[PDB]
């Protein structure tokens, strides 16, 4: 059998007995086939419904206990066996089971002792009986439990980012049944940026929270902090959802969605105007965003007809998410809490945004059609259909009850997107996976991202360029190195995937992959470096591993600076040079301009020797295990050499001018009739004029000063004339067109 065989039988008996009572009385016999088809979140709900009508059947109750046993939910499984046992006493093997499980989970309660006594008298002196007798003794004493607790605390002092240890603390709290302390630590730990990114931790967070909601302690204490803990559950679900989608398979991700949707339906009823309500708002958006990503995962593997229909469905999901407003940040108690929520807000808008675009780039106003056709409530049932099995009650499912009102159906603005990205860099602990995706998403767009601003948000007060550039010691790392690094990681990643899709043939849709579904986009080498330099900078390394981490970074530095044995293809170097020139040429301050321009000259000075050999159609010495994979896809050709020599010579003059060699700079600038040379020629003529323009000074000199301002005016005019005429030149502008016009207005009024 398969999934089709079992979900098609739904329509077989649905057409034979349609009343609700007989539909649920078939739940046990429905669940009979899902246990065989490996569906355990589904089989659970089928049998549980038959139990809602046949609550006195010992067979059905035991089957759920055996299913909760496969789920390893001891507290839930035990209770199920109990019901089957109290209905039918002849089930001896279940009296053993109850005794077996009670002694394995926790011995503190005498209930484990009681059921063991009964288990003994049903099986006199059997081999398992002693086994349980030794197990019950195994558990440690009060001094022993406190002893274990002290180890974890002393261990957590120096290792607060260890996933396993923090998990054990929650398990120890849960073992002493002081769940309030378990969630308390669970709540204070969702502020940890590292733990929030851990799949296993968030899963534990979901259980320890749920356990507390149903726990007797949650009700008795008070109903005031009840809302607070409820928020964390939603937060955990969002984080857990993001991670499960990437690593786990299609089946597990869908199952988590149902837990997410159940929680949302249970929360919306309270409402209010506090952190929980604001949290519900942001988490609501995440749900659709992840739901859209989940949809696209299924379609990727599937045929073309489902792909378009699913992507259409996903496009609506991301849209819903993007529409959701920025959560009310002020309304939260603390700075950490509010900053986190906003961080996630930026993440939602950024990821959904780029997805919305790449899906809208497929066709003309593709977004408009999606809304006009599926914004209809008919889509709400078509969405619920594709994602879930229709058998689940469509009433308590948040998805089926949401009010889809006035979908904006407005494509996102790039400027807004940039600020969304920059604000969400710290969303996923700056994993190179995170950044390599964004960098690639902007690779198809006409505006480029502020990487240098990304790096400033991660490594604060890291200098743009280090004074001691002579050595490769990794204490001299600079934001330029990282910017230079990320450029290659993305330039490398794009080419590798380009080669991959060529091999995949089938249907070509390279832009469409979402962030969770795709696998590692960088080489494990590259990822190891980024993870190292990150842990080092943020001061979350290990004294022992310091020297190793430190050396691992040092290994690649000589390559990021195009030094001895750099594994750099000439094309990648060129890409770095111009990408830094244009990045720097648009900057306002002199410190940063000089730095970015310097490195650009550096890489230029390293390429030109290579270009000369390539200019005569010779061979480049290929690398030895290069850091950035070489590709013949982008191997440099002779057709473009003379331009680069020209484009490079400008860079020389620009630096000569900045250094003071105006005579040589001007002599060079005038030599080449380039749009960029105008903005440079003009900018330096303007400065020679402005300073000398108004002081009392020799009249003859004043006329010569004015003469330069006259030259400034002309060159700005040459820029705009050639700009309005041709679009290709507009893109060559070192600064925005309006900035050139802005100066001109002031230049002429002078």
């Amino acid at each position: 059998r398969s999934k089709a065989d079992v979900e098609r039988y739904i329509a077989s008996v649905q057409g034979s007995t349609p009343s609700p009572r007989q539909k649920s009385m078939k739940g046990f016999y429905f669940a009979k086939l899902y246990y065989e088809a490996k569906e355990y979140d589904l089989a659970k709900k089928y049998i549980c419904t038959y139990i809602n009508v046949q609550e006195r059947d010992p067979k059905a109750h035991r089957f759920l206990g055996l299913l909760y046993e496969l789920e390893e939910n001891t507290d839930k499984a035990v209770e199920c066996y109990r019901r089957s046992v109290e209905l039918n006493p002849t089930q001896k093997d279940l009296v053993l089971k109850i005794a077996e499980l009670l002694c394995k989970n926790d011995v503190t309660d005498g209930r484990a002792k009681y059921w063991l006594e009964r288990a003994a008298k049903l099986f006199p002196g059997s081999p398992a009986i002693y086994k349980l007798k030794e197990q019950l003794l195994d558990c440690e004493g009060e001094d022993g439990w406190n002893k274990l607790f002290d180890l974890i605390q002393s261990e957590l002092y120096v290792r607060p980012d260890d996933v396993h240890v923090n998990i054990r603390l929650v398990e120890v709290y849960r073992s002493t049944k002081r769940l309030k302390d378990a969630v308390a630590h669970c709540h204070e730990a969702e502020r940890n940026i590292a733990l929030r990114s851990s799949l296993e931790w968030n899963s534990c967070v979901v259980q320890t929270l749920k356990e507390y909601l149903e726990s007797l302690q949650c009700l008795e204490s008070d109903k005031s902090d009840w809302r607070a803990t409820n928020t964390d559950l939603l937060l955990a679900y969002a984080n857990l959802m993001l991670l499960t989608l990437s690593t786990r398979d299609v089946q597990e991700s869908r199952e988590l969605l149902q837990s997410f949707d159940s929680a949302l339906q249970s929360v919306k009823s309270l409402g209010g105007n506090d952190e929980l309500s604001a949290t519900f708002l942001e988490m609501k958006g995440h749900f659709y965003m992840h739901a859209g990503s989940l949809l696209l995962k299924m379609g990727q593997h599937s045929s073309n007809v489902q792909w378009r229909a699913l992507s259409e469905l996903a496009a609506l999901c991301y849209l819903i998410a993007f529409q959701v407003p920025r959560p009310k940040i002020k309304l939260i108690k603390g700075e950490a809490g509010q900053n986190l929520l906003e961080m996630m807000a930026c993440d939602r808008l950024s990821q959904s945004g780029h997805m919305l675009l790449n899906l809208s780039r497929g066709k003309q106003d593709f977004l408009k059609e999606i809304v006009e056709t599926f914004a209809n409530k008919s889509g709400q049932s078509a969405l619920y259909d594709a994602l879930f099995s229709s058998q689940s009650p469509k009433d308590t499912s948040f998805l089926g009850s949401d009010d889809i009102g006035n979908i904006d159906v407005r494509e996102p603005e790039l400027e807004d997107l940039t600020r969304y990205d920059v604000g969400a860099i710290r969303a996923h602990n700056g994993s190179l996976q995170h950044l390599t995706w964004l960098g690639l998403q902007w690779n198809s767009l006409p505006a480029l991202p502020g990487i240098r601003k990304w790096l400033k948000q991660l490594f604060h007060h890291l200098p743009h360029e280090t004074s001691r550039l002579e050595t490769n010691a990794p204490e001299s790392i600079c934001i330029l190195d990282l910017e230079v690094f990320l450029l290659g990681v993305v330039y490398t990643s794009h080419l590798q995937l380009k080669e991959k899709c060529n091999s995949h043939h089938s249907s070509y849709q390279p832009l469409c992959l979402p962030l969770p579904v795709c696998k590692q986009l960088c080489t494990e080498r590259q990822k190891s470096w980024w993870d190292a330099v990150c842990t080092l900078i943020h001061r979350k390394a290990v004294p022992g591993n310091v020297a190793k981490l430190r050396l691992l970074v040092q290994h690649e530095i000589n390559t990021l600076r195009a030094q001895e044995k750099h594994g750099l293809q000439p094309a990648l170097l060129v890409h770095w040079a111009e990408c830094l020139q244009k990045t720097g040429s648009g900057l306002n301050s002199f410190y940063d301009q000089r730095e970015y321009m310097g490195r650009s000259v550096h890489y230029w000075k390293k390429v030109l020797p290579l270009l000369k050999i390539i200019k005569k159609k010779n061979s480049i010495p290929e690398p030895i295990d290069p850091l950035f994979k070489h590709f013949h896809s982008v191997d440099i050709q002779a057709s473009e050499i003379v331009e680069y020599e020209e484009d490079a010579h400008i860079i020389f003059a620009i630096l000569d001018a900045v250094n003071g060699n105006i005579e040589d700079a001007v002599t060079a600038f005038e030599s080449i009739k380039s749009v960029v040379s105008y903005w440079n020629l003009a900018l330096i003529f303007h400065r020679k004029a402005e300073d000398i323009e108004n002081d009392a000074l020799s009249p003859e000199e004043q006329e010569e000063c004015k003469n330069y301002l006259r030259k400034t005016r002309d060159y700005l005019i040459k820029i705009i004339d050639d700009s309005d005429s041709n679009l290709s030149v507009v893109k060559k502008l070192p600064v925005p067109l309006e900035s050139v016009k802005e100066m001109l207005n002031s230049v002429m009024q002078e």
Partner: antibody, heavy 129, light 108 residues
């Protein structure tokens, strides 16, 4: 261009709490180990806390162990000395200083620092009810 | 616990003298000792690191030396600007300790 600035001092009552701020600039804060060294009036230098260069494992003198807490923030490029259960005995001039990774060596049984190159001006802390 | 015993506590000398201060480590300690100059009220400044290596910028008349567990600071020709208090410092495993200090008073 390179300096250390101490702040967050002032007077406090015994059994109270304070928080000192050692602001650094000009050298990469990640690769530097941070220390605090107090000096009562007319007395000598007393080491009270340390933070290993690249990770930040703490180490305190037994005279203040468990009461003080020293921390380092990469985003703010600043170190702090959190002080609790302050006693009249803690009245002293508190200095901070760095020791590069070049001078920070890790060995079996604990770590050692070759010397303290950069020192701060020193912020005064008075503890008296 | 390791202890750095500094001697003398208070010294009196005049200009040009060849002055010597010594610190003894109770336990056998490796060459991870330092020396500092602290003028009244000001901050302490680093003179010698790693026992006998001179900190860049410190005058050449300062020199450190070791013999067994006794470390010694040596000034070849005393100058007027060196009349201040000095301290010796050891860095053992996850612990730092300073000497009691040595005041260099002008003799008259």
């Amino acid at each position: 261009e390179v300096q250390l600035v101490e702040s967050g001092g002032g007077l406090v009552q015994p059994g109270g709490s304070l928080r000192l701020s050692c602001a650094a600039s000009g050298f990469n804060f990640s690769s530097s180990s941070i220390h605090w060294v107090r000096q009562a009036p007319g007395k000598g230098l007393e080491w009270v806390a340390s933070i290993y260069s690249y990770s930040g494992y703490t180490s305190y003198a037994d005279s203040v162990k468990g009461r003080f807490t020293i921390s380092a923030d990469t985003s703010k490029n600043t170190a702090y000395l959190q002080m609790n259960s302050l006693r009249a005995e803690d009245t002293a001039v508190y200095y901070c200083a760095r020791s590069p990774w070049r001078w920070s060596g890790v060995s079996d049984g604990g770590f050692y620092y070759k010397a303290l190159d950069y020192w701060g001006q020193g912020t005064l802390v008075t503890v008296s009810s | 616990d390791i202890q750095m015993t500094q001697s003398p506590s208070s010294l009196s000398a005049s200009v040009g003298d060849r002055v010597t201060i010594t610190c003894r480590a109770s336990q056998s300690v490796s060459s991870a000792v330092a020396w500092y100059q602290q003028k009244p009220g000001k901050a302490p400044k680093l003179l010698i690191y790693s026992a006998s290596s001179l900190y860049s910028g410190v005058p050449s008349r300062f020199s450190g030396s070791r013999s067994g567990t006794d470390f010694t600071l040596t000034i070849s020709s005393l100058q007027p600007e060196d009349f201040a208090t000095y301290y010796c410092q050891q860095s053992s495993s996850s612990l730092i300790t300073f000497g009691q200090g040595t005041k260099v008073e002008i003799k008259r």
